């Protein structure tokens, strides 16, 4: 996250860190807890990965430097990548992770609410993106979970900044014309959440953008409402 600040405990209790351990352990992506055994993230987080035994999913953690060999983590039972996701193309950048065991809910570990199928922003005027990703292009993973407030941009205006790519109705964009505040490398798969009437909901999944926090280059997110039929079907069928 570029231009953000340090979060406090319990602000973002759905945020998870998706890490891998081969010989060394590293944070790769964010994700959102959406039910007791389900994390929602980006499909591109699985491109160029070994099989799932490598993953360690941390929840209820604010600071990655607080993680030790004894810190509990979740393991993966199932990965459900959208059937129509193709890496070169980048549409349908969405994936479900089923955990090996359900998590107990606490103030620091609980699920984000989901939108209804076929929902529109606006109504979303107060949106935030979180993660442990780089704080500048060519930066490094941050220790304390970062937060930043970013306005949604219309698909028409987002499209003008991305002549080579089609901005579809299944994407949502967010950013400042002057840049300076954005998701970045390592924020993939994490949440774009908006507070409406006191309650937070998951509006987007961090996906792509040109560099990080450049002027006139908004972040692009998978629009969760446009995949609600898929999320429900896949999680019901598995459960």
């Amino acid at each position: 996250i570029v231009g953000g600040t340090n979060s406090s405990w319990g602000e973002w209790p759905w945020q998870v860190s998706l890490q891998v351990k081969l010989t060394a352990q590293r944070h790769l992506c964010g994700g959102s807890l959406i039910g007791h055994q389900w994390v929602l993230t980006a499909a591109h987080c699985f491109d160029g990965l070994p099989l799932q035994d490598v993953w360690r999913i941390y929840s209820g953690i604010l600071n990655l430097s607080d993680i030790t060999k004894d810190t509990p983590f979740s393991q993966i039972k199932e990965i459900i990548i959208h059937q129509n996701y193709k890496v070169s193309e980048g549409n349908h950048d969405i994936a479900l992770i089923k955990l090996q065991a359900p998590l107990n809910y606490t103030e620091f570990q609980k699920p984000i609410s989901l939108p209804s199928k076929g929902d529109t922003s606006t109504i979303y005027t107060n949106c935030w993106v979180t993660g442990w990703g780089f704080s500048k292009e060519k930066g490094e993973i941050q220790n304390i979970l970062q937060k930043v407030n970013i306005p949604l941009v219309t698909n028409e205006e987002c499209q003008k900044r991305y002549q080579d790519y089609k901005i579809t109705q299944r994407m949502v964009c967010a950013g400042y014309k002057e840049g300076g505040k954005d998701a970045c490398k390592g924020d993939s798969g994490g949440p774009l959440v908006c507070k409406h009437n006191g309650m937070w909901r998951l509006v987007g999944i961090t996906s792509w953008g040109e560099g990080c926090a450049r002027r006139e280059q908004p972040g692009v997110y998978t629009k969760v409402a446009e995949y609600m039929d898929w999320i429900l079907e896949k999680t019901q069928s598995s459960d």
């Binding site: 992506c29 160029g48 980048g90 490398k185 792509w208 953008g209």
Partner: peptide
């Protein structure tokens, strides 16, 4: 994954 994506080896 293309460079526009945000995973560490895109």
């Amino acid at each position: 994954c293309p460079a526009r994506f945000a995973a560490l080896f895109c």
